[model samples]
Target: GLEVLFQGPMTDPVIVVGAGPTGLMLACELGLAGAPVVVLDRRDAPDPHAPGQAVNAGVVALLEQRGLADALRASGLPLPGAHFSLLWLRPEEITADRPEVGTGLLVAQPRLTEVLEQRARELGVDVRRGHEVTELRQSPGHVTLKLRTSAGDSTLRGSYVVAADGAGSTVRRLAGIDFPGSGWTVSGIVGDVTVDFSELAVHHLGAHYLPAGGVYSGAPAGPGVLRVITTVFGATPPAPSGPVAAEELQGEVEHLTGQPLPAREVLWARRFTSHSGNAERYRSGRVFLAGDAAHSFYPLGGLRLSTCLQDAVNLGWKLAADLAGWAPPGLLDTYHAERHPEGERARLALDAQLALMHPAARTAGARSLVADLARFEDVNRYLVELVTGVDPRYRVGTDGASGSVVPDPALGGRVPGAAPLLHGGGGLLLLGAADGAHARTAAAWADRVGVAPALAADATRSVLLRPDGHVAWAEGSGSLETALKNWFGTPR
Candidate 1:
């Protein structure tokens, strides 16, 4: 086992395990920052028929910076609005004051991964498929990984390692990170199938509450196909011991709809429970956790993928900075500090929604009360923000924009000059001082941060945006040097 198969020098590259959406996106960010990266996945190729996922507004804003938002929007179905525990929230009534917060998209997961993988490849990321990480051991300077590939076994070493390998992450387990949480008694059946719409009494792309103490929802999965889901509260069907049969799904749909659902073909089906958890720590020594490896919950309102992808984006730039030799001291530790709270928030929100969804009779009053409260405009907006994951406020500093997600400067046609803002995973400083006072001060860190003239309308209002799109400082926030050192590290 000690015989080296293909080990590289220490501090050479970042080894990212798992080539799904999270891993690929992180690789893209690192590649954009010019950091050497390698992505490994057990699957030889992406599953074209993988289930679809939801992309919320906040994620859309982040993707726009990377020039990925437009393509994703075009490929996906624009969600009409947001929801809470399956309760529809009208699009018109819901509003987002923050540019990062808005509407969402319903796109196939495989397609999203394809888009990310292509971008990563363009950035020169090495993505090795069919390579599963069998074991990992960490050292002072780097982490060593043992991989099992189609040919045989090999070994690799990198300065840092990230586990974006989903909830059942082998890397996370090997790292011995504690993931603490509990599972609910709730059980459900989810499947993608070709349905004969003509045979169904209900033919639409939405969910409905059943009188039989469950909820049934059907949405367009593809041409002539539907992704159907049915959830029953207080029902603990024995955990699926095997593949969910096509007949079982067909019968469940028919039972819920109270009519014949002649499902022509079953693409995939499975059982799910409200089992939820969050990693106790996002970072441990040279290894870190991202995506579902960091946290997981019931997939409500497409929060799982949205949150997971954001995790990748947030950690990617920081890791790149460290590799590039500009990351501030304790910068790596902030991954857990800043993102762990977001993970907890996602769990809290999902658990709250779960409580409102389960045991229809027991939760009837709570649902009713929530419905009534949702009528208030503020309540409606808050719920929308919560479900869409657009309500994150980091504790970066006291300034308003410091901890907040910076608005996409490109969205309003706002850029310093001909070039896009934060185009290549670098920091941007929008200097409000027309005299270039702050710009002159920021020039010290020019290699790590770009100085741009502030937006014309806010000529006196400066803003500092991190690569991940979070504001580090504003004109009136604090000293430019302090903010710079805090986020960008020592000046060149």
Candidate 2:
């Protein structure tokens, strides 16, 4: 057991555990909002191989808003679509002609880590790899943690702590936060490889799913590689003891699809599962959990990383606002109030998909019904939004209008000026073209909210956007004073 030590005054204001995507992105967001954040990772160095190789449109939108989209696209190909329980939904079919609807990204997880780490460093995040947060304990005012680095053990303090240390989080463990949810009943295999499995019928095919027994899967990872995955149905496939042999994955995949897969070399291999869960609470006093620390679920919809990274982004600005002294009364707690539900919602859907994916005749009939309903434009769009996480109205106030996700016409053409919209920073007051009165009213809170004229396509007046990009209020919807007060904590 690690020794329990007491520390003096707090050093870093925000100490983020785990230097993976969530921690790095959160650190960048905090730094961008003027908080000194420190990131600690147990690994000596970053993993060179790609892990979470997919992200949905919501993530793409957030990255673009934070000015990371162009760089990310340059790093990897654009995947303009997604699947639901192995049923495909092409972006072209689901996307309406709107600016608010964002595209999906397919950059390698390791590449994204590199990009976020670089940004974190540039923004003055004290990233210390190989330094593990061995122990943690929190009080009302501060959180102290023991770290076992190569230089040996020492205690550090922070006003708040963020746990992004993956599914088995040390911070969540030490804080005694309960991650009560359904455990994994089924497991699947996934491996990224570069080999000539061209003899296999499904290898060259873009993507294939086994419908009979289990959802056996195969896809082209890149130019010369095949990504293979399948669940060994009706049996608890005990956790692999060591590295899974290439033949083992080939056998499992073949068992499901009943096809010969001549796997030559295995780049990387691992077992995955439909195991799903969420933390009982995302926040505990001075400690917060983001990414896998908060929720763990199947990676089928491809929004696992997207949703978790958004959790980091959503919580980061709020935490920074608290540190900067402009935050509202309940804004800090809203991090959990908002993101925890999103995690629970995503995991719920994953569980539903899991139930529908088996070979049982009842499940097969339900799948057919779902597939039938998916042909309709409205149903398809809703499922797309749900799966990719594009449609979310954060619960900000008591109104049909409050917390509504801003649409294309409301955003207008993005304007750049002296008060250019700062990414992941301040709130934006979007002024309508004919609404000079609204502009004057918003200027009173200009110190707290960025005031800018929007080239909106609608005939109405103004809209107030929260820092995290949820609509606080539109002119026709609610009063400015109340909406501003609710979201930004009384006008500046």
Candidate 3:
């Protein structure tokens, strides 16, 4: 019976059609869970410049919890209140203890990608670049994709194909998934550059900056350089292709911050616009969408990258469980059900930030009031949680909320001994009682679920943690054994 059930890749191995952060994260997650994964991308290698500086605290915590975000922490600057559309919200304002989704870890995007790609490689994910998905078709049993590569064209089969391929997702296009959202006619420019902030010599412009002409925030890109964005651009049809000229960017800076940012060298620049939209659903048949494929938002909130990683983490284990033939029914669909709402929440927040910062936003004076509101401790704590994603827990039975049942290990905070165990990619069952009864109940399924002793407390009398670091089932609710079966599947 075991041989018949597990012999072949009856479920085609997972094929992720993009090798950026989202796709890379999913690959790492699946590999950790022992799922076979392959990544298909058009580029042969990761870009040296583009995942440009600016990491969000929410996503940073997820990676950190898994013990993977350390490399980034060493290099990134922890900034507070900066990601909100170039508006300054000091990290010090919140009196709450240091956050788990604390302040953001600001590093160039490429470094983060480099770290994740290496992790995926170490985990043995088959990352195949120089390939592009041109056609897609799904049957009852599997999904088939036609890919055009440097060598030629070929077809690949998979049980599921996750399109993490940025906003202009080709796989999504082929699947005929209608991306319904508002598109941007106006565009903005962002890039990495060497700025002479010493000569910037503007007492008027310091760490706390929000000029009416527009806004800009500076962070150490590296030695003698800073990564900056004008936060104001109204290029009609957008710029001409290729690298953005230094003069154009300089003018944007002069007009935006009202200060001359002498550019020693303009490292990289790209023109981008935003789309206020999402797909009808995150899942379409056997094909799933993650990252920009599923949703889009204005950049400054820092929610986009953070949410993408969360998407990867959420979808990763579910797919791994599905491949292992143990995921409960409808588990796959929950990816859409849960993430879509969260996506909307982030979208709404970013929308608020975008409007508040826009010079043309009619009720513009209200932004000053919102800024005042951000100073209150409760609002500050909630916004930190909201933007960083440590707040939104998945909707499971009896949890009733989107975040934590017991937030003793609130965002950026840790549980004394349990932190290390959960990120390894499986479900964890913490039975506070050491008696044989609890262990006996979980024994048959021990290989898939972890049974461990929890901290002594009635609230945490029983705790079940999913691989993504959220509680699956906890105290005073349903049967621990039943919850185990519900998440980990039938017992041996």
Q: Decide which is better by TM-score, 2 or 3.
A: 2
Better of 1 and 2 by lDDT: 1
Please report, in order, the local distance difference test score of every candidate based on alpha carbons: 0.75, 0.72, 0.71
TM-score of each: 0.90, 0.88, 0.87
**Candidate with maximal lDDT:** 1
Write model 3 residue lDDT over 373-440, tens digit each, in one string.
87786776666666655567565664322233443232212232465666666766677743256677
Residue pairs in clash, model 1: none
Q: How do these models rank on TM-score, best leading?
A: 1, 2, 3
Output the TM-score of candidate 3.
Answer: 0.87
Q: Between which residue pairs do clashes occur in model 2?
A: none
lDDT of 2 by residue, 1-492 (tens): 344456544445799999888888899888888887889899999976545667677777666667876777776776666678878765466455533344676666777788888888788778888889988877778889999988899888999999999888898898898887766456777777676655766443444455665765566656677666666656566673235767777777667667646666788887765447799999889899999889988777566887778798788888877887777788887788778888998888887776777645558888888889888888888778777767665654432123335432333122222122556467787777543466666676787688665554232446677766666676656577777776677666
Better of 1 and 3 by lDDT: 1
All models, RMSD in angstroms: 4.3, 4.5, 4.9
Clashes (backbone N, CA, C under 3 Å), per candidate, total 0, 0, 11
